[PDB]
RNA sequence: GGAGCCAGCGAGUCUAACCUUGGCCGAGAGGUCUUGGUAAAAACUCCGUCGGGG
């Protein structure tokens, strides 16, 4: 009676921390800067399971997508993948001239 | 001549014209069969007169319904009133008075808005 | 006369839109087959 | 040092007219 | 070389001048002698560059506008691998007129980069688009025959498409540039970016453009010059004229 | 002469279509077929007129 | 016109109601022809013209 | 995000912004082209997706 197994929590990628249990789309959104279509396209560019968890995505595919995010324009990628005194003068002028207006009227 | 009859139905601001003539047993509402009225919860309310009476009396006739104006529920009540008064009129004109009367009794015992509408004029004291 | 004698003795446009045939792009087979 | 001389030309043309 | 010195003058004054940095294109304006024939509609006709590219479809954000139902359009263009990463957004005209109004139209102009629509709806397009897009001539949408199939008289038109053909068409219109036909003598055309390429690219650009516009053949697009071209002035939107090739 | 020949062909075409339509109005029992190329035509019943 | 529309008097009987007919929209339809006999040719007359 | 579908008053040869970039034309008056930036049916139903604030 034995079976063996083939999980990592919140990651520190590019100066900010991102959660560890939710799918790779929500992961690549919580990474600071970029968007959903960007996420889905770069993940199908690196050929990773869309459905897998952030607890999944072990170190080799992790560093691969790190390479992609650090240098995207090398992967057939588009540009939508990246990301007083006059008040004083007008106040004083109008108030002064309207003062004189009151006085002459 | 073709033995035919015509009636009107009316909710608050909509109009439901119903032609009824002898035919092959079909329904048509705005050039589309009546399995395809829109609101999909009041489709049964449209179905109500047929399911009140039976089905053979609508197996031996031809309806043609056209509605204009109003909104959803208003149109729907309009169509049901039009179908009711049209069926009763066709029965009155071409078949027996006794069938017309039993039709009228079953309808009005169920719900009188089928045979007479209420255009809601206010009551000022 | 040979044309007339034989018959006597025997491109992207629209029908309704004429602005298309100047407005289009005469695409290049290189700009098709190539992958930049 | 071309830009200034041509805008000079523009100004002097208009005032010449 | 006088041309190249003048271009140097333009780019260095562009560096110094505060307003000139904030607009980032170059226009060649031509004055010829004679008035041109065709009335000015708003179908920008394209001009080819032979040696030097300008822009990349994989570099600009794209809007596509369809016929009405747009279902097979959107799904196929989204799902079939040649245009999966190309267009920023596809939308139909009726959906557009429902969706965007006034300030929303202006936000569209602020956001999206280049617009292309079907040929069969270009004629109606600027009316829902208004004239904020139609200030001058920069963001003029183009027109693209979608299905590579032609409608004969008295026959039902076939619906189809191919990402192959539409990708080639966008790569053509984004590689090379477009002009607008007028009636008056003077005309203008955008040529090149000040940083994306350099002065020899710009001179070769000008040579190919004036050659294609002088050539007698290819008449629906390239036979635009009637009479003699008098002079060419290089200028930005906010710079001034620099005169070359006066005779 | 070429123009005249082409004009003649057009005229005889229109005359034949009009002639079949004119014969379509007299008598008999008619039967409508669609030739699967897409042609519309007729065929009469085997019925000798009196 | 509006004051006539106020006093419509909805009971009248003009004998032209046997000959005129009306759209469902309410507007009164009229003929391109004008007459009372050329509403539709009959099959004899169409034989002759054809 | 799609897709389905519904009203009613209204019609005076009458209904409409701004500054800016320059070419050419004319004695002008100004005319025409060119060019950049700022003010101005819906709820309904059904399907598909997601689950503190600058």
Short mmCIF file of C-alpha atoms in Angstrom, two decimals, chain E residues 14 20 24 28 32 55 62 97 116 124 127 146 155 178-180 218 231:
data_model
loop_
_atom_site.label_atom_id
_atom_site.label_comp_id
_atom_site.label_asym_id
_atom_site.label_seq_id
_atom_site.Cartn_x
_atom_site.Cartn_y
_atom_site.Cartn_z
CA UNK E 14 12.75 69.18 -33.19
CA UNK E 20 8.25 69.93 -31.46
CA UNK E 24 6.46 62.91 -33.39
CA UNK E 28 6.14 65.82 -46.85
CA UNK E 32 2.47 71.04 -57.91
CA UNK E 55 5.64 49.92 -38.84
CA UNK E 62 -5.74 47.44 -34.05
CA UNK E 97 -23.31 52.67 -32.13
CA UNK E 116 -9.56 49.01 -40.22
CA UNK E 124 -21.20 54.33 -43.49
CA UNK E 127 -21.16 58.82 -39.40
CA UNK E 146 -12.41 40.21 -46.18
CA UNK E 155 -26.28 36.27 -57.17
CA UNK E 178 -1.12 55.98 -47.44
CA UNK E 179 -2.11 59.33 -48.96
CA UNK E 180 -5.41 61.11 -49.59
CA UNK E 218 -1.16 51.75 -61.68
CA UNK E 231 8.51 71.86 -54.73
#
